Design a protein around this ligand. Structure first.
Ligand SMILES: [Cl-]
Lengths: 170, 216
């Protein structure tokens, strides 16, 4: 149990040899990323998201789960500027990877994170009348993996999946 | 022209016909004869409603039978997992062109994750990749994996190999040969089900010997 004054303190902890630390470091970042827009911006300024997305692919499962929560929270309370930054880092593919996992909770987290990115595309379409993130999700095999979830056991997942397809794709 | 039509029909359709013994499955031009044999027992072992005092199989796989977070699936699921594993093992491990890997990956993910008999392939880059060479490649590598499974010996206390593990980014498939048949099980990639204190989730089922013995 411990506190930190500086934010780049954690950047060191996320690149440690011990998984047990990295996991809990990611869990802490997700609490910060759950906060307001300035708190999200702090994490962006400390260059933390680049290593989170690297973790979200390469790290072992228990760590990825917390790294996923962190990124989805960013997309939830983040500004259009901040979300575009995450997409530019290439967070869509890492999220689409999680869609096929066994844990229902982690699937919903991925679906929310993708939905947040897709709903931003609705605004961007008004501002070439097309959603730019539809193409990126399809190219990351996300479209098909969402299609799979339409036949999923859990009610909360299969309704979300059907909604995303009808609203943004089909 | 015609090639695509056939290749799609074969790869994107997991046909299942109900029969007296169990099911007749047809996919990628391959027939399978799936059966109920063993599933009766498999349920009694988990819930712990059996006649004898103990069970050797129940003791060897406590992360399945004595795990409250584990659940039993049908033999059809077992077949799909093996097929998905065959693709994942023989093919995706080597370094080949990325659109081909994504195609095989999608197909194994469809087999492994869903129970749907049709696969509406919406990813376009893959959809163009679907060739007869691709189908041919899958077919041979399914047969290789089946022969590889047939080479397993029943669980023993010698050095004889009795199981096969396939670790993906998001999954761990383990297929072990027992007296009942092939015990197929799917865990998280960190094998959280093995954690004796707080056990993680695991789906599992049985594929009876007969289904594979047709190929050997
Ligand atoms: Cl044949």
């Amino acid at each position: 149990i411990l506190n930190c004054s500086a934010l780049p303190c954690l950047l060191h902890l996320l690149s440690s040899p011990k998984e047990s630390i990295r996991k809990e470091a990611c869990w802490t970042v997700s609490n910060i990323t759950a906060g307001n827009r300035a708190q999200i911006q702090a994490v962006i300024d400390a260059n933390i998201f680049p290593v989170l997305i690297e973790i979200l692919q390469k790290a072992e499962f228990r760590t990825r789960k917390e790294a996923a929560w962190a990124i989805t929270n960013a997309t939830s309370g983040g500004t259009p500027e901040q979300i575009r930054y995450l997409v530019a880092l290439g967070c869509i593919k890492p999220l689409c990877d999680l869609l096929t996992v066994m844990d229902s909770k982690i699937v919903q987290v991925a679906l929310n994170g993708l939905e947040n990115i897709l709903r931003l595309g609705e605004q961007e379409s008004k501002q070439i009348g097309i959603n730019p993130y539809c193409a990126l999700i399809e190219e990351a095999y996300g479209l098909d993996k969402i299609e799979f979830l339409q036949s999923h056991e859990n009610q909360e997942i299969y309704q979300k999946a059907f909604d995303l397809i009808e609203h943004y794709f089909g | 022209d015609l090639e695509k039509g056939v290749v799609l029909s074969d790869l994107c359709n997991f046909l299942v016909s109900q029969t007296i013994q169990g099911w007749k499955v047809y996919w990628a031009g391959i027939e399978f004869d799936v059966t109920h044999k063993g599933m009766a027992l498999l349920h009694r072992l988990k819930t712990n409603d059996f006649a004898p005092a103990w069970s050797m199989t129940r003791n060897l796989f406590p992360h399945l039978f004595q795990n409250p977070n584990s659940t039993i699936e049908s033999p059809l699921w077992a077949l799909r997992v093996i097929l998905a594993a065959g693709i994942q093992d023989q093919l995706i491990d080597q370094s080949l062109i990325e659109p081909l890997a994504g195609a095989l990956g999608l197909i194994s993910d469809w087999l492994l994750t869903t129970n749907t008999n049709h696969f509406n392939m919406r990813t376009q880059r893959v959809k163009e990749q679907l060739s007869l060479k691709m189908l041919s490649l899958i077919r041979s590598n399914i047969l290789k994996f089946i022969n590889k499974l047939d080479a397993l010996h029943v669980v023993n206390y010698n050095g004889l190999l009795s199981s096969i593990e396939i670790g993906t980014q998001n999954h761990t498939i383990i297929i072990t040969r027992t007296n009942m048949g092939f015990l197929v099980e799917l865990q998280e990639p960190d094998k959280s089900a093995m954690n004796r204190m707080k056990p993680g989730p695991a789906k599992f089922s049985l594929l009876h010997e007969s289904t594979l013995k047709a190929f050997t």
